[PDB]
A = this chain, B = another copy of it.
């Protein structure tokens, strides 16, 4: 599979700053190399140079709006470019607010994309339902068409135009959803598989149904926004908003292995990896190594094994 790597060192979507080191630690772990070690065509577009917006006071409760809004705007253009070059966008991110730019830029070139959101949270709070004001918990609200006329003109987001409909997304791993968010899920009829559904059905059926839900009508590009906190913090401890009872390492790999096999992956986000939050050096490497493993499965690494189209017995 041919990838286009985009480093997105941004954190203003939430409090803790260490998340901007994500692209750094991931590359350092040998991500580019390992992808190449696989049948992958990799082009590194570098880390986006996000500038400091000194004058960025809160919009009502919303924090760092201009900073977050600009970073996604910049990211949107980069993703559209990589997509225009026939490459799967791989956004090594900071906080999940960048999904606004990633999914948006992706949709410019492929307006018919389906989104799969693996997270412990729905991140669908509106600037008016959020309680923390952190924009990494509001990305989905800006992207939904049905929520248009429900989001205030937030400084820094005028360039945004809702690109996905409530029926074009599936959540997997949910276990910490606010009341307002829950009301939105049920009101717009968004399809989700919280940890309760994973326990009931098994990750296998969850993926069967998820892929059926988005590809039944017809094949369409797939955007996978993966938040490392979707997995249990026993696997990805170095993250800002960990919630117990998460997806396992295996379930994480199963999900991505199944997405890969569709041959329809078009955009990928690996978010919220924050080294600065590992209680120990090992917790950092455990988080980074797991993040890398999920990324590799997205592009073909199979646990059963891989082999070239040659005769190994000769």
By the criterion CB–CB under 8 Å, are A183 and B150 in contact? no
B199 touches A250 (CB 8 A): yes
Name A141-172 residues within 8 Å CB distance of B. Answer: 150
Q: Which of B122, B186, B305 is the one whose CB lies under 8 Å from A181?
A: B305
Which residues of chain A from 186 to 204 have a CB within 8 Å of any chain B CB?
Answer: 186-187, 192, 194-204
Number of copies of chain A assembled together: 3
Contacts of A245 in B (CB 8 A): 249-250, 253, 303
- Given A312-B179, A312-B180, A312-B184; A303-B254 close (CB under 8 Å): no
Given A202-B202, A303-B175: A313 and B183 within 8 A (CB)? yes
- Least distance between A16 CB and chain B CB atoms (Å): 22
Residue in B closest to A257 when the chains form the complex, CB atoms: B196
Contact partners of A250 in chain B: CB under 8 A = 195, 198-199, 245
CB of A57 to closest CB in B, whole Å: 26
Are B192 and A199 touching (Cβ within 8 A)?
Answer: no
Q: Which residues of chain B are within 8 angstroms of A198 by Cβ–Cβ distance?
A: 250
Enumerate chain B residues within 8 angstroms of A200, measured Cβ to Cβ.
Answer: 202-204, 254
Subset of 8 A-B contacts with CB under 8 Å: A150-B313, A179-B307, A180-B307, A183-B310, A187-B313, A196-B254, A196-B257, A202-B204
Known: A182-B305, A199-B204. 11 other contacts (CB 8 A): A122-B305, A126-B313, A129-B312, A179-B306, A180-B307, A183-B312, A195-B250, A199-B251, A201-B204, A244-B249, A245-B250
